[PDB]
Amino acid sequence: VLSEGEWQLVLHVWAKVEADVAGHGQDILIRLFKSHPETLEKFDRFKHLKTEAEMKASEDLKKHGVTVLTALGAILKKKGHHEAELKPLAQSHATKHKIPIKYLEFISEAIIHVLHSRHPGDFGADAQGAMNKALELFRKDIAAKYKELGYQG
Ligand code: HEM
């Protein structure tokens, strides 16, 4: 359970993201795909991209980055009271997209890295710890829905 102080730290940096959702989403997906190439293989939509320059030039990848970060922002802004938002996301990622929980750890690391790069003055250690806790809460709650459905592994 995050404290109100931890949520404020999370949402203070998140408000900076919402100034350039698309640039953040590109940086985060690209870092994900470079750091963990097995993730790229889950996107039939993107698996033709073989270089970081190709990734940066894909408007379709930039669109998906906005989709991802818009869904994550709506979850974060519920401060934990996010059951309605997670249900559908867990269900599609477990049963349709077939995304292991570990890959949600990987994209959480990429989000934290990108926020540190773009917002260092609002992403000191206190805020990095709080965002780590927020993303852990996201993964914990998704993992409980995966387990229900027979996908926690
Ligand atoms: C912060 C974590 C994430 C969020 C908030 C998120 C959100 C979304 C949303 C909102 C959609 C479209 C609606 C739906 O299908 O449910 C989507 C699609 C999808 N996501 Fe995620 N996602 C996350 C992480 C991941 C990761 C780590 C992967 C793969 C490694 C992945 C793979 C996919 C795939 C394959 C699609 C369908 C893309 C397509 O072909 O259109 N997601 N995601």
UniProtKB/Swiss-Prot annotation:
Question: In which residues is nitrite bound?
Answer: H64
- The positions annotated for binding heme b are H93
Where is the PTM Phosphoserine found along the chain? S3
Enumerate the residues binding O2. H64
- Predominant location category: cytoplasm
Q: Main EC class of this protein? A: oxidoreductase
Keyword Transport present in the record's keywords: the answer is: yes
Residue list for modification Phosphothreonine: T67
Q: State the protein's purpose.
A: Monomeric heme protein which primary function is to store oxygen and facilitate its diffusion within muscle tissues. Reversibly binds oxygen through a pentacoordinated heme iron and enables its timely and efficient release as needed during periods of heightened demand. Depending on the oxidative conditions of tissues and cells, and in addition to its ability to bind oxygen, it also has a nitrite reductase activity whereby it regulates the production of bioactive nitric oxide.
Name it: Myoglobin
Organism listed in the record: Physeter macrocephalus (Sperm whale)
Q: What gene does the UniProt entry assign to this protein? A: MB
